[PDB]
Amino acid sequence: IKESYAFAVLGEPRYAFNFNHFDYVNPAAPKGGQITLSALGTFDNFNRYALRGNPGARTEQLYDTLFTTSDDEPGSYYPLIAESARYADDYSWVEVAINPRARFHDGSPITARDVEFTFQKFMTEGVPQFRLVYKGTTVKAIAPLTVRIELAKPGKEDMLSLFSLPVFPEKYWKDHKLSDPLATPPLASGPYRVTSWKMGQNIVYSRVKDYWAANLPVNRGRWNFDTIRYDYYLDDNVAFEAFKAGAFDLRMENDAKNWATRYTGKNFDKKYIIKDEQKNESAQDTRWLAFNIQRPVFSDRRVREAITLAFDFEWMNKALFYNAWSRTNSYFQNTEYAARNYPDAAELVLLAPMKKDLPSEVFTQIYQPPVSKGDGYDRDNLLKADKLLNEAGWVLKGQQRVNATEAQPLSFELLLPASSNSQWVLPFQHSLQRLGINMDIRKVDNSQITNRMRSRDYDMMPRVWRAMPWPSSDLQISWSSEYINSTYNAPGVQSPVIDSLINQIIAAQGNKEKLLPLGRALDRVLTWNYYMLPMWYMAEDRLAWWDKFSQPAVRPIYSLGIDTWWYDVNKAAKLP
Amino acid sequence: MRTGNAX
Numbered sequence: 001i002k003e004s005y006a007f008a009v010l011g012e013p014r015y016a017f018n019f020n021h022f023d024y025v026n027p028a029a030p031k032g033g034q035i036t037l038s039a040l041g042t043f044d045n046f047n048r049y050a051l052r053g054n055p056g057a058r059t060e061q062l063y064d065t066l067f068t069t070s071d072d073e074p075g076s077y078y079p080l081i082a083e084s085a086r087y088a089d090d091y092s093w094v095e096v097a098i099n100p101r102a103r104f105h106d107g108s109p110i111t112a113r114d115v116e117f118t119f120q121k122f123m124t125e126g127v128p129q130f131r132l133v134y135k136g137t138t139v140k141a142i143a144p145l146t147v148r149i150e151l152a153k154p155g156k157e158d159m160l161s162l163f164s165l166p167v168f169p170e171k172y173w174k175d176h177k178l179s180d181p182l183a184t185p186p187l188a189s190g191p192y193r194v195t196s197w198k199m200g201q202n203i204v205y206s207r208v209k210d211y212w213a214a215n216l217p218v219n220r221g222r223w224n225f226d227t228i229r230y231d232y233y234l235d236d237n238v239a240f241e242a243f244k245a246g247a248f249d250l251r252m253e254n255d256a257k258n259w260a261t262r263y264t265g266k267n268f269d270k271k272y273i274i275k276d277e278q279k280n281e282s283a284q285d286t287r288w289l290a291f292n293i294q295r296p297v298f299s300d301r302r303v304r305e306a307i308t309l310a311f312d313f314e315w316m317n318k319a320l321f322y323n324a325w326s327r328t329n330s331y332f333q334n335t336e337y338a339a340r341n342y343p344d345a346a347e348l349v350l351l352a353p354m355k356k357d358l359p360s361e362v363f364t365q366i367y368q369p370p371v372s373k374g375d376g377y378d379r380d381n382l383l384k385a386d387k388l389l390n391e392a393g394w395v396l397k398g399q400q401r402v403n404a405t406e407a408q409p410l411s412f413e414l415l416l417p418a419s420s421n422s423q424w425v426l427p428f429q430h431s432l433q434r435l436g437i438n439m440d441i442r443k444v445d446n447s448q449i450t451n452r453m454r455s456r457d458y459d460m461m462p463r464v465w466r467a468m469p470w471p472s473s474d475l476q477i478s479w480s481s482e483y484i485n486s487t488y489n490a491p492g493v494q495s496p497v498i499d500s501l502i503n504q505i506i507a508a509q510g511n512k513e514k515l516l517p518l519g520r521a522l523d524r525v526l527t528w529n530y531y532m533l534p535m536w537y538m539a540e541d542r543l544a545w546w547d548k549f550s551q552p553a554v555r556p557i558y559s560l561g562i563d564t565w566w567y568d569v570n571k572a573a574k575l576p
Numbered sequence: 577m578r579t580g581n582a583x
Contacts, residue, residue, distance in 0.1 A: 048580050055583065122579065133578050161578065454581055477578060487582040 003086045007067065009075035009157050010470060010512050015217075024072055024556040025221030025564045031207065033548070033567025034227040036248040038239045040419040041446025042200040042232055045181030049126060049166075052454075053181035054447050056203045057230040062188040063166030066096055066115070066147075068218050071556035074283075074469035077163050078218045081110055091156040091510075096163075098145040103212045104169045104189045112141035117170040119162075125178035129477050129486040133158065156510035157473045191223040203230045221552070224566040234445075235419045243544070244273075250545040250562070255421050256324035259542050272575055275544045282557050283335050283467035286328040287535035289414075290463045290490035292456055297412045301359075302392040304530040306385040310431040311533055314374035320423050325536035327369050331526050332468055333537060337519030339367060339527070346517040350501070351524070357497050359528045367527040369534045385435055401436035411438040412459035415452060418443040420462070424535075454487040463490045463532065469558075471519035473506045479526070491531040498525060548572035 006013040021027045043056040067077035081102045087094040102110035119139035122130045136152030139162070149162055172187035185194040191214070192205040205228040213219055231248060233239035240258055243251045244267065253259050267273050291298040291307075298304055317325050330338035343351060343363060351362060361367075372378035389395070393404040401410035414429075416422055425441060432439050439460075444452070452458055468475075477483045480502050481494035501522045508514040527534075541560060550568040555561050 051581070060580065127579060127581055130578050165579065450583060474577065488577065 001087075001089055003084060005079060005084050007077040007085075007160055007163075008073065009160060009472075009510060013070075013076040013078070014073050015070065015076070015078060019078065019217050021217055021220040022070060022072065022556075024552055024554045024561055026552045026566070027221045029221045029224045029552075029564070029566040031224050031566075032226050033224075033569070033572070034229060035225045035250065035549075035562075035565075035567075036229045036231065037250060038243070038248045039230045039232050040236060040239065041234070041417070041449075043203070044199060044447065045183060046185045046194065047178075047180070047182040049122075049178055050181045051127070051179040052451075054450050056194075056197070057232075058192070058203070058205060058228070061192070062186065062190055062194075063168070064102075064110075064189045064213065065164050065166060067160075067163035069164070070218075071559045071561060072554075074558065075157075075160070077160055079216065080213065080218060081167055082163070090154050091151075091159045092154050093148065093150045094159060095142070096147045096149065098147065099213075100145060101212050102189075104187060105193055105208065106169075106187060108169065108171065110167055110169075110189065112143060112145055112147045114167055114170055115139060115147045115165075116141045117173070118165060118168045121168060121173060121178050122165070127486070129483050129488075132482060133473075133477070134162075137162075154509070155473065155506070158509065161473075191219065192228060201232050205229070222563050224564075233419075236421050246546065249548065251543070252560075253542040253544060256321040257423070259324070260322040263544065272547060273544055274547050275542075277540055277542050278555070279540050281334075281539070283469040284333040284537045284539055285467050286330075286333050286465045286537045288328060288463055288465055288490075288532035289460055289535065290458075290532050291530070292459055292492055293531065294456070294492040295412075295459055297410065297459060300392045301530055302388040303394065303410075304533075306388040306392075306435075307432070307437070308530055308533050309370050309381045309385040309388075310435055310437075311370070311428055312372050312376065312378060312381075312431060313369070313536065314372045315376050315378075316424050316427060317536075318374045319376075320427075325538055328534035328537055329367065329369055329527070331465060331523050332471070332519055334539060335469060337468075337471055337516065337523065339520040339523035342366065343521070343524070344517065347521045347524075350504070350517055350521045354497050354500070358525065362524045362528050367524065382431075382435065389435070396436050399436055400438065409438060410436065411440070413440045413442050415449070415458040415461040416441060416443045417449045417462075418445055456490075456492055460533075462535070465532075470512070471505045471515045471522065473509055475505060475522070476502050493529075493531055495525075495529075498522070501525060546575060548575060 006016050039057045043054050045053040046056055046059050048055045048059040064080050066082040068080040070076050081099060082096045083099050085094045085096045098112055104110060116139050138150050140148050142148045151159060169187050191208055191211045193208055195204055195206040197203045207226045263275050291304050293299055313327050317323050332338045370381050372381055394401045394410045395404045429439050477486045478488040479498050481499055484494055505518045548568060548571055549565045552564050
């Protein structure tokens with residue numbers, strides 16, 4: 001019925017008419033030069049899609065996809081390997097036309113068969129959540145350059161997400177299981193190719209100079225550097241010192257003390273290094289500490305509420321962090337879907353049927369993480385923590401909390417990446433000790449952190465909840481019970497309340513008017529159950545770089561736009 | 577994420 005060259009999850013695509021290049025690029029940007037970047041931890045293989053292993057920097061971008069997303073919109077799709085698509089009004093089937101000029105790096109064509117092969121490969125050797133999400137979906141080459149996708153139930157976002165699948169060359173991947181790590185880079189297709197590396201230490205990408213899609217609208221003014229090099233550092237302090245010394249070119253500064261007090265010295269005086277701070281109005285990544293609620297120590301909501309009360313954010317922000325941070329308080333932070341007011345009538349129609357299985361505060365209060373006076377030793381909050389612990393059966397015997405029936409101490413392990421700056425850890429450990437709670441600290445390397453995060457082999461560990469601009473069907477992978485082993489369910493929660501709210505969200509894909517009370521209602525359930533302990537976020541981007549680059553006039557809303565930068569040989573000439 | 581494990 002319909003045929004289009006652009007798509008959007010909600011509303012209309014911004015570049016629907018006369019699309020020559022994005023607003024946030026310089027179409028005339030020159031090619032050449034190197035950018036060197038840091039990475040924290042280590043890596044051991046090149047397959048981002050395997051069941052295990054520690055994949056190298058940028059290995060999620062080795063392959064082009066059927067459509068690609070703009071960076072100044074939440075979810076709009078524009079042609080890459082595909083030229084266009086025909087589709088049913090409900091998006092339950094689509095026929096994708098493949099660009100006949102599309103090529104892998106060895107010069108061979110990308111065909112409809114490669115896409116069909118790619119879907120079956122993920123279905124049979126991929127991450128276990130893929131065959132669950134696309135249960136009943138088929139992907140079939142119906143012509144040499146036409147792929148037909150059919151969904152067994154309506155899912156406009158699930159359809160559009162298949163446009164982001166990497167398109168694998170069958171001629172290489174027929175000889176490699178998708179679940180196995182790769183010691184060597186696979187045959188690929190994107191604008192940059194791995195050309196050298198040292199296992200665990202560096203990866204070098206080279207610009208593909210005859211890249212078949214270099215002049216497509218989505219690519220104009222992007223992929224300008226001839227070389228992108230990643231050097232690995234074991235902790236962020238030595239990385240920050242290497243940046244100041246000139247060892248790499250660009251730093252995203254996530255430490256408040258570094259920004260407030262350490263952007264000093266010869267290289268800043270002579271303006272060799274540029275420091276930039278821009279406010280950011282869009283959806284925000286948030287930091288949390290995950291409670292593993294499958295372990296007895298964190299199975300009681302009252303214990304999780306009490307440990308949250310012991311986390312003195314106002315003191316940390318004032319005494320340690322130069323008042324730089326804002327407190328995390330939503331799984332839809334800084335969007336319309338955050339539950340920052342009282343439930344309206346539409347939300348109550350969604351929530352009231354489940355009042356038996358909900359904390360009563362969902363209906364009567366706005367969720368607010370604990371606030372202290374910032375002086376330290378908050379009497380009100382620590383008295384309330386004691387009150388909740390006693391009710392849950394953890395009582396003081398001597399100086400240590402002990403189960404009132406068994407007599408087993410209240411004790412747990414905080415699992416920590418050795419690479420992180422963790423100035424907040426000892427203050428939190430001290431506050432818990434004053435409640436009689438023992439928290440052991442275990443710092444481990446990047447490979448053990450990845451292995452144990454995936455298997456949930458922890459009592460508590462830090463987790464980042466990525467920015468979610470609308471209530472996406474991805475939510476089921478992180479929260480719904482059948483996806484408990486996807487590696488994205490940090491607390492280990494299997495709740496029929498969550499499941500019903502997310503099943504309604506998945507049934508309303510692409511329908512904003514109904515996703516709005518659904519998202520706010522889900523936010524209330526996730527926050528009021530204290531599945532995780534809210535830390536902090538900042539709505540500004542703090543960046544610094546050596547002055548060898550120039551940038552477009554406009555920065556994209558949803559990323560920093562580094563792939564639109566270029567090497568400026570006049571500015572570079574002025575550096576030592 | 578439907579195509580890869582957490583990192």
